[PDB]
Structure 1
Amino acid sequence: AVVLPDWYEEAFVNVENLFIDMFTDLLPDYESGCWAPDDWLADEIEVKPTIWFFRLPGGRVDWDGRKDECQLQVMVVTGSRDDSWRLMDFVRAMLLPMQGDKYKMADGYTAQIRCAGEVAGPQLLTPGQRIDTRVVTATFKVSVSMKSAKNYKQKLYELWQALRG
């Protein structure tokens, strides 16, 4: 994959990964992800329910405040409008009342959701090529505390003071 420097440690959590883990624990059979899998698109007439989380440009990160704000778009895809609305209601009930809630992701790291407000409300999108799937989409503003606000200015200074200076 990517060979990051040895002295570097992750500072931001992955909001999409955190919510994918959360809603795979909450809904085990129904698959949630950040993408449309090739095998999920194989069946359309009898489509399995799914939830998609997409990080979107929104909110201002506060490195000094140890806050990572982002806009999250949740797309609930089911075979019926009633099922899509029920699943979107479940997602909203899970996300909206969060305030300083902790959650241990699959990585073993316990994140902390500072707050989760709604930017754009749910709406049933018009069908596209996939005609038998009813999708309900909503955008949330999710603020999550960073893993660590530690800076690596020392390593950055060492780099150019050893190579150039």
Structure 2
Amino acid sequence: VVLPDWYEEAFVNVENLFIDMFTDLLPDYESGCWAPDDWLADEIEVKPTIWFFRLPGGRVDWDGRKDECQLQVMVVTGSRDDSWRLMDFVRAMLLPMQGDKYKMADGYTAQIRCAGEVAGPQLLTPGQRIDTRVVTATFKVSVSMKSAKNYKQKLYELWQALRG
């Protein structure tokens, strides 16, 4: 952590927002954006996990203070019915999101503008993992920006100090 002090942050990291809000909603079922070794230790019985991986798609405008990304939702568990009901719960908690606030442990509270839908649920065939049931879907999630002020100034004075 040696980033310059005059710069604090640019974006919200909406996947961190989502994983934190899902962990807070139901602490019993863990959620994240990785594959912990503890979860991979047991496969016949697996704790239901929600995974969010960023996918390409969607432009961005700094002037309009708008950001969007095609963040996908992937749920894995030991039963097809459990996976389907978890996906239904996630869709009920994401699709009807129009101007909703949620606060992170960092201090700032994010603003979700609209969470769209691109592709429906995908019951992927069991490959490397057989017993676990996995369902994949993609959401078009648009989020606001924390700070949209431009950093032309400091770059300009750094350039002037370095060369002139």
Name the TM-score, length of structure 1 as normaliser: 0.97
Q: Which of 120-129 and 94-103 deviates more?
A: 120-129
State the shift of 1:130 in Å: 1.2
- The question of whether the paired residues in 2 share the 8 Å contact of 1:24 and 1:30 is answered with yes
RMSD, aligned CA = 0.8
Report if the CA contact (8 A) 1:76-1:87 is conserved. Answer: yes
Q: Secondary structure at the match of 2:54?
A: strand
Alignment of 1:75-114 (within 5 A): 75-114=74-113
How far does residue 8 in structure 1 lie from its aligned partner after superposition? 0.2
- 1:35-69 per-residue CA deviation (whole Å, 9 max, x = no partner) reads 11111100001111101011111111111111111
Aligned partner of residue 103 in structure 1, secondary structure: strand
Task: Name which of structure 1's ranges 122-131 and 138-147 shifts more when overlaid on structure 2.
Answer: 122-131
Q: Distance in 2 between matches of 1:29 and 1:58?
A: 33
Give the TM-score normalised by structure 2.
Answer: 0.97
How many aligned positions are there? 164
| Aligned equivalents of 1:144, 1:160: Cα separation in 2 | 33
Contact 1:15-1:55 within 8 A present in 2 as well: no
Say which SS state the counterpart of residue 32 (structure 1) adopts: coil
In structure 2, C-alpha distance between the alignment counterparts of 1:106 and 1:6, rounded to whole Å: 20
2:153 is aligned with 1:148 = no
CA contact (8 A) 1:103 1:110 kept: yes
The Cα of 1:106 is off from its aligned counterpart by 2.4
User: Aligned equivalents of 2:2 and 2:57: distance in 1?
Assistant: 29
Distance in 2 (alpha carbons) for counterparts of 1:108 and 1:137: 31
Q: Which runs of 5+ in 2 are unaligned?
A: none
Moved more, 121-130 or 133-142: 121-130
Extract unaligned runs of 5+ from structure 1.
none
Instruction: List aligned pairs for 1:1-40, cutoff 5 A.
Output: 2-40=1-39
Report the 3-state secondary structure (helix = DSSP H, G, I; strand = E; otherwise coil) of the residue aligned with 1:24.
helix
The DSSP-based 3-state class of the residue aligned with 1:117 is strand
In structure 2, what is the Cα distance between the partners aligned to 1:57 and 1:123? 18
Alignment deviations for residues 56-103 of structure 1 (CA, whole Å, 9 cap, x no partner): 111111111111111111110010000000000000000000011111
Deviation, structure 1 residue 142: 0.6
Shift of 1:108: 2.5
Shift of 1:141: 0.6
